[PDB]
Amino acid sequence: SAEHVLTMLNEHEVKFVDLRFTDTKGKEQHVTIPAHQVNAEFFEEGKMFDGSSIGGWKGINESDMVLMPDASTAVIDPFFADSTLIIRCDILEPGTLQGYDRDPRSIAKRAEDYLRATGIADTVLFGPEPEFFLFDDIRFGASISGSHVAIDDIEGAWNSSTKYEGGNKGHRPGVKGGYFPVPPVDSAQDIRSEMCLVMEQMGLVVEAHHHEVATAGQNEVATRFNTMTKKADEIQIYKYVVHNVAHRFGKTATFMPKPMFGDNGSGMHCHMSLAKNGTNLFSGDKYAGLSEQALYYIGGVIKHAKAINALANPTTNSYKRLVPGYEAPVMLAYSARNRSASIRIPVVASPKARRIEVRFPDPAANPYLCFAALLMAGLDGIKNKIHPGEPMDKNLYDLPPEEAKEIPQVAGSLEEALNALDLDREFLKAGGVFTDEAIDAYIALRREEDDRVRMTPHPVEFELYYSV
Amino acid sequence: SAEHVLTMLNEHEVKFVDLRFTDTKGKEQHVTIPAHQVNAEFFEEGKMFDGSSIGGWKGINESDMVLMPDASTAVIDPFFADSTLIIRCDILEPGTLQGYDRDPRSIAKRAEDYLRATGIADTVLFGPEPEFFLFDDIRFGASISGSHVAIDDIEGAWNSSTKYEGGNKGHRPGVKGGYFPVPPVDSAQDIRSEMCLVMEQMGLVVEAHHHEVATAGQNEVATRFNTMTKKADEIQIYKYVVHNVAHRFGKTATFMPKPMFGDNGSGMHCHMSLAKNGTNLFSGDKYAGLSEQALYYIGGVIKHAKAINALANPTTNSYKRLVPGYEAPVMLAYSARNRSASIRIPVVASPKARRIEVRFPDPAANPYLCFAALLMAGLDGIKNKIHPGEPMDKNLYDLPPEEAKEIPQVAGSLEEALNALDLDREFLKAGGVFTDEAIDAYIALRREEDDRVRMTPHPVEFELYYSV
Amino acid sequence: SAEHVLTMLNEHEVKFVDLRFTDTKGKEQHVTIPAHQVNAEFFEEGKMFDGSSIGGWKGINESDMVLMPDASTAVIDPFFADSTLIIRCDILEPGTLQGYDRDPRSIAKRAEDYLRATGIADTVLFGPEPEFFLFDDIRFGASISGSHVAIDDIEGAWNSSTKYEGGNKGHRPGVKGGYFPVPPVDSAQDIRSEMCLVMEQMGLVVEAHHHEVATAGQNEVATRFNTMTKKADEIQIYKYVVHNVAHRFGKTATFMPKPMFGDNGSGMHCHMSLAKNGTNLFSGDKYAGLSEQALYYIGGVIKHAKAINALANPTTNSYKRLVPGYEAPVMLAYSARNRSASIRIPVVASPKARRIEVRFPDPAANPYLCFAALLMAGLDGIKNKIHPGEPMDKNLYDLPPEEAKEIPQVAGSLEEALNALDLDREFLKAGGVFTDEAIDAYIALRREEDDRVRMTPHPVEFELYYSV
Ligand SMILES: Nc1ncnc2c1ncn2[C@@H]1O[C@H](COP(=O)(O)OP(=O)(O)O)[C@@H](O)[C@H]1O
Ligand SMILES: Nc1ncnc2c1ncn2[C@@H]1O[C@H](COP(=O)(O)OP(=O)(O)O)[C@@H](O)[C@H]1O
Ligand SMILES: Nc1ncnc2c1ncn2[C@@H]1O[C@H](COP(=O)(O)OP(=O)(O)O)[C@@H](O)[C@H]1O
Ligand SMILES: CP(=O)(O)CC[C@H](N)C(=O)O
Ligand SMILES: CP(=O)(O)CC[C@H](N)C(=O)O
Ligand SMILES: CP(=O)(O)CC[C@H](N)C(=O)O
Ligand SMILES: [Mn+2]
Ligand SMILES: [Mn+2]
Ligand SMILES: [Mn+2]
Ligand SMILES: [Mn+2]
Ligand SMILES: [Mn+2]
Ligand SMILES: [Mn+2]
């Protein structure tokens, strides 16, 4: 929308333009330009900027990259005081201009191209269910003499005892209590509803909202699926709207996977299906109404799971969630019934809506990278006709070791997930989607994060070992 | 009102739709959907959702159920910020679609069907008097090192001594003092009146309101009776309006049966009568203007009392109320005079208003389940011509052991009430209204709640036993 | 000393007898008996007691074991108010009476027997350097809403800024500053000297004491070596004296491996050598004055390292220490020079003192188990002539990846060390020293400890991931 955008500036008396793009870890970045700085060439050649002080784009020598505006992504920021227009950008290589090896958005697009290229399908569909928490106060820190973390929300079950300024009104969700109680137990209708209204104003399509299992404000807003790349965009918008609406209500939102222990962690399940000329390639006559195609996808996903983990579970914390008992599946199996399975097959009337849901991904995942990895492992399962085996229609979390069931499982730690992506990197490099250093850079970043957690004493260690 | 609802969306520029239904324990649940998500098929096939993380619907394998909107139940939420429409839903079995075994609302409907089926009558009438308290502050908790509870209201008699920011204005209801003093002793006219206005706006019909016996804000709002199922609906609305209006006035409401000790507990008396073609089957020429029919109903209720208790007194706390001296009857007898009797026969001019009042039910009861149990025990008393014996026209609470009167009485504890429902489950399974696992599931839930109270040391035990 | 002990009761007007023994994790346990309860048979048949409520001896059915006093171990407790005599006991199987499979002390003795049995040598020598810290205040905890740890000592470098009641006297050890400054920088001469005096009074032989590298009171007391089993005894006494003298000085001691981060962790290096008829089998004409024998020992130790880790590094915290830069070697190599090597060969004048020092063990290790594992891996290296390869005389911590040196290294985590001991369990079962369930029980215990740390969110995760 080069043209569309120009009209849109006059239509909203736009004063600024916010250029946004996404870094390797997944954090959305931005830069502001006065509306007058937006002209003809701005669209065809973008603007100059130094990526050097960005995570893993480093190159305090060569990485002077280009921000390439995407006329289609334009939309007003609903939080900023002065009328500003947001425009998602792509990171292009200077001069060459075809797309940075490390730009996650470019990588996602590359993967979408390769899909049409292998002729397997013409569009990928993603529908993620990104969960989160809403707190009132969050404090933490680490120093040589100690470390800590403190969470607090009005909904926190621990506050049943707490004294309040104007009295304790006591209607709080108990542990795992947070599912669907009517207000006042659910302090957040009005909040979620805003996030919804806003998200829609920003282009997303809201299917629904509701409180979620855990005490202390766990909530979820369900949004309608979309083409893989546009969806990862929407995810960033989602998080923004969430983070900010929360902020504006004097709350603080977090998409971290396992903030509290002992309370059903926040996760981002991934619904997928492939299409070709308006037809859903995932419907057929095999298990649950699935096509042959889908099962190969499943086989791929299951094969490359640990590697995919590194993208869809990029945090040490991610692994604190992936445990039995909290609606977090670790078992690399599929089923329409059994919910101990990380891949669940939604049962549904028509064939138009047949698909798969890969439940192990969490919020912290870089949408673009995570989605691509899912897609590429799916394609590899198809090309190589990888059979997913038989569906799990047995028992839930720890009924299994009756024959000590050791069926495939997601990565146990982050080091694992990483090292796996190191080795099993082949399916990602296909179609030149992922490049080696793009992948080696990511591994490096996460490796240093993992170091911190692995090296800093944990409070519990004192509980367990001080009196040793 | 499939049609009606659509018009109602445009009429109120409705932005959202709140789907509400009721869980096993009785807690109303909800989920929000954008108004645009409401279409043609939404009404005929409902929406999909996982019940797994709900009390006793568990089935982390098969329980992927359907929310079936009931076009008639539609009404605006008066508390939500963005214009939203509420719609009560039924929980249907996927595919089969005729009604979940454990959906309390389905069970209530089943029981109403069975009434017309036995041809005994064509409609059941329920008129409950649900009492409650309004506090300013409520705190409590239990940990290994102790436990506690602290209540506080501006009306609390204990505050006669308390120092206040702008001075203590001292007009408080004494113990059992809270009946009908004119303000300012009664700090709640304006509050109750709101609850009334609102309740009416939400479809209920208010007959009256007044403060109630106990100090510390006990209050009651009397609402007009209705067909058994529609009434249990109204109860949920009632509680909502109460809970929320209270909240909005900086108060906190509780429908728990016995919050404080030493002060006439909150209860939900149940007025009932059966009808057939506009005629009141409960009027006749026997005791107090009653029909033969009514007395068989009474006999049934009295026979199945302990089992009914499990539904109409689902809490350990419920049994802290059922004691002499606080207008809580334990004696399983009937009378128009003596108010020591749990069933009281309201005396009234015409025959059009003849009925019975079963006083032992409390607030905590799942309306649907509780009502059904009452109805089914009534029907069983009729089919089997169970005679209620002679009316109690003697003395009140402890004049009786003169011949150590041991006439039938309501369950002494919860374990009892439960175990009773276990055994005497037959009259409930009639007409396939209650199913075994529906009943076995309920018992299980309550059994774990009872465990907690039974296993956690009580403060009083220290008072009584520490120096042992 | 059945006889000796009796005289010793009259000699000190002993009032009580403290029976002590050691649990699986390594924690010394005790039970008190009046001196009069000590008689003739007490020595030959011990006393009865239930082990059931002890870590991994569980058996709430069969584990009613015997405490078998060891007349030799008798010595007065210097801290107890009433004159009491301590007596180390062995845990024997009831009736059979030859020694519990899980009694770590029995296991240590078994291993010493097997040494003389293989005729390889007649006595094993252990000289451990167990380091520790002395704080003034230690607080920590974990709950659903958070977790934390707080360390504090008068020596803590962080206190340079801290305000004190009678003024801040500011002579504190900086980070890694804590090595040998003269008081007042070293607030602990008098303290260590007491621990020394006491330790000696309790039978140990003190070679020396000194402050140690880390700020916040890290200290060490060097004690003279002894026969493997008697030494692990002395370790327990050591820790006791330390823990208690500290306590009595208003301090609090901890032998946990890595309390603080950023400051040279506390470790327990293990000097070893074998003997036969007063001759030191570890001296020869090979590297550094070593015998052939020693190098096979080294080879064994290096081969079984990861398994040995599970015994000599039983804590998740243990692995927070095993990192470059803090005098904690991870490299499974030997050298007399290079101190990047986990096995260091002390250079020394005579042959009488030739030996090896395995530096990776830490304090938290169960002396008995840890020592045995070291010994058994040493013996296996000898029987199977396992060559230790060439000594490391190269560069320190990260000069190596020049050819990305991947020489053998100690376990990276605890799960690893455990799983390793699972598999490589063979050399331990030799001579029936370690039994399968003895080993399977240990693994189980530690597995649940590891679970806690692995499952509880770490403060740093918030620092790193909250704003994700
Ligand atoms: N191919 C597809 N056809 C239809 N819906 C899809 C498809 N691929 C993904 N979806 C997504 O399914 C998700 C929504 O439903 P949700 O109620 O949150 O399910 P769950 O019960 O698993 O949490 C949306 O993101 C929806 O758009
Ligand atoms: N069949 C019936 N005919 C008339 N009123 C009925 C019938 N069944 C139930 N009722 C109910 O009696 C209740 C109201 O009166 P209330 O003043 O609160 O009495 P009480 O003095 O026992 O607290 C209402 O719920 C009313 O609608
Ligand atoms: N066979 C042996 N002959 C002599 N000393 C030995 C032998 N085996 C172990 N040792 C022990 O070496 C340890 C002491 O010295 P230390 O000064 O703490 O050394 P480091 O500089 O490595 O910390 C003691 O525990 C000592 O008794
Ligand atoms: C589908 P659901 O709502 O039961 C929850 C998933 C869980 N929050 C997660 O951590 O994945
Ligand atoms: C009819 P009423 O107003 O005298 C009171 C009943 C009593 N609150 C309850 O616990 O049942
Ligand atoms: C021999 P040294 O005094 O230099 C120290 C060893 C170190 N504290 C550890 O963690 O082993
Ligand atoms: Mn969810
Ligand atoms: Mn889902
Ligand atoms: Mn009343
Ligand atoms: Mn009444
Ligand atoms: Mn040292
Ligand atoms: Mn040393």
Swiss-Prot record, chains A, B, C:
Q: What does this protein do?
A: Catalyzes the ATP-dependent biosynthesis of glutamine from glutamate and ammonia.
Question: What is the E.C. number?
Answer: 6.3.1.2
Sorted alphabetically, the keyword list is: ATP-binding, Cytoplasm, Ligase, Magnesium, Manganese, Metal-binding, Nucleotide-binding, Phosphoprotein
User: Mostly located where?
Assistant: cytoplasm
Q: In its UniProt record, which GO terms are filed under biological process?
A: glutamine biosynthetic process; nitrogen utilization; protein homooligomerization
Provide the gene name from the record. glnA
Sites binding L-glutamate sit at 264-265, 321, 327, 339, 359
- Highest lineage ranks of the organism? Bacteria, Pseudomonadati, Pseudomonadota, Gammaproteobacteria, Enterobacterales
Provide the cofactor list for this protein: Mn(2+)
Residues in GS beta-grasp domain copies: 12-96
Q: How does it assemble?
A: Oligomer of 12 subunits arranged in the form of two hexameric ring.
Under the heading InterPro entries, the entry gives:
Gln_synt_N, Gln_synt_N_sf, Gln_synth/guanido_kin_cat_dom, Gln_synth_cat_dom, Gln_synth_gly_rich_site, Gln_synth_I, Gln_synth_I_adenylation_site, Gln_synth_N_conserv_site
Which GO-annotated molecular functions does the record name?
ATP binding; glutamine synthetase activity; manganese ion binding
Query: Any idea what this protein is called?
Result: Glutamine synthetase
Listed binding positions for ATP are 207, 271-273, 339, 344, 352
| Catalytic reaction(s) noted | L-glutamate + NH4(+) + ATP = L-glutamine + ADP + phosphate + H(+)
Q: How is its activity regulated?
A: When cellular nitrogen levels are high, the C-terminal adenylyl transferase (AT) of GlnE inhibits GlnA by covalent transfer of an adenylyl group from ATP to Tyr-397. Conversely, when nitrogen levels are low, the N-terminal adenylyl removase (AR) of GlnE activates GlnA by removing the adenylyl group by phosphorolysis. The fully adenylated enzyme complex is inactive.
Q: Give the originating organism.
A: Salmonella typhimurium (strain LT2 / SGSC1412 / ATCC 700720)
Which annotated residues bind Mn(2+) 2?
131, 212, 220
Record-listed O-AMP-tyrosine modification sites: 397
- Name the family the entry cites: Belongs to the glutamine synthetase family.
**GO CC terms, sorted:** cytoplasm; membrane
Query: Which positions are annotated as binding Mn(2+) 1?
Result: 129, 269, 357
Q: What does the cofactor section's free text say about binding? A: Binds 2 Mn(2+) ions per subunit.
